[PDB]
Design a protein around this nucleic acid. Sequence first.
DNA 1: GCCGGTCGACCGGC
DNA 2: GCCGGTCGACCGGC
Lengths: 246, 243
Amino acid sequence: SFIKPIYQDINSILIGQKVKRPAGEPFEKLVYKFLKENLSDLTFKQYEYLNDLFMKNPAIIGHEARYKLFNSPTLLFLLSRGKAATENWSIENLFEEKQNDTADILLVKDQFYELLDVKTRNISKSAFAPNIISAYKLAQTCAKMIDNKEFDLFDINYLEVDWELNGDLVCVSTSFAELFKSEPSELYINWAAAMQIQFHVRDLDQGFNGTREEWAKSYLKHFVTQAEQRAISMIDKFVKPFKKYI
Amino acid sequence: SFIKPIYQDINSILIGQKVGEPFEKLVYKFLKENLSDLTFKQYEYLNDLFMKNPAIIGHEARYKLFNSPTLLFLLSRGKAATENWSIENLFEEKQNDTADILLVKDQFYELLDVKTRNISKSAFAPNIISAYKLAQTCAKMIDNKEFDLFDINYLEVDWELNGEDLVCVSTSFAELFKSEPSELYINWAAAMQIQFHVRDLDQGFNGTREEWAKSYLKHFVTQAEQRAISMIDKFVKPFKKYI
DNA sequence: GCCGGTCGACCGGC
DNA sequence: GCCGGTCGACCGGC
Ligand SMILES: [Ca+2]
Ligand SMILES: [Ca+2]
Ligand code: NA
């Protein structure tokens, strides 16, 4: 992680900070801005990242060509836009943001990538652990890590930003965590909720003590297990209760 | 539908005015200017139903005000929020709310939900309403035998950024309970949500509401079964080889 | 404490 | 044409 080193300054900086008001999504703008002010050469929005990468090789055109530019089936898988969209990319037609992009920020250096996703959170309101990342996307991710044996390329990390309403919104606190540093098997997969791993960064454990490859293998086990179970529970929850009306 | 008659009226004005989109607010206005009398935001309606009965208090009691195991289900905000309600502590908008707009007149409820559709970006049908919520609804409907109480209608609002702002391009209007059930797409991963564009929605169903519920339920059961099988093939067969 | 449903609308593979 | 996964968080029942 490139950002733990200065997490305290981030912490201190953000705590206090305020934003306008019509959820606290725009708090991420500040993270990016701050990160942009103390890690300039490592910080990109994910679209911003693709852009630079496609600008650096203006001759490489066409999506299959541009895809080769990643040098990593896995990173290829997490950061890249679609074929047509890769096809039609151009200096006059840059990538813009996209709800469904994996990361909110990339910190990259010496060909190591940190994918930062910023979970905002209204602590005054209830406490509903939010979507973290797709369980299925995380699974395909692991398969690739083994299949290409890319176990020392990137990490997925989270920066919670707590805030509350005050006349203006203001961050009262923040947490930070590392995905690949948590227990694969304790991860809560919410299937209906777009199959999203769900937790509060605050409460995420970091006691994991094995290799990255092991982690992938343990996650894939958890996933498959929960997948089998879910298939079964659907009969109970979704069929059984309604057979009677037929 | 208290909308269908004046659909022409609505449509006409909608096209050409500007403002994720949120013309949802726009339309409300029209319906308020022209129907201020049976036009509520869902939550607004609730303050009204609660303001108009200052005697009844606590939740157990306040739900009787719905006089409907079904509307209750679809409209209620739930024990604690309801218990804690009072004129100095009114409901606000809740992301979770079933409806965007509510037209109720002579004890018939029209549950309206607009769908904004960036018509320039993609043809990605949006979530229309959780299929499982709907199941529960149909079940209640059946049970409590209340087929002539409420409609769930949609009104699409297309748009593009042809200018400094967005801009409505055109609209559409369908009725969930006029569609063929067995035909509705249930995207399980997407919050178990029925997905469609209003413009493409079949409106050719000619049975009883009782029939519609019975058919929709069969469709749900069938589709819940295939999804469970889909999971094995999609999220189990392909990864077993890594363990 | 524990658990999992809902709104919102969004591409892109073949 | 046919399909369906993804980000965003967010509530209440026992
Ligand atoms: Ca985020
Ligand atoms: Ca809506
Ligand atoms: Na809906």
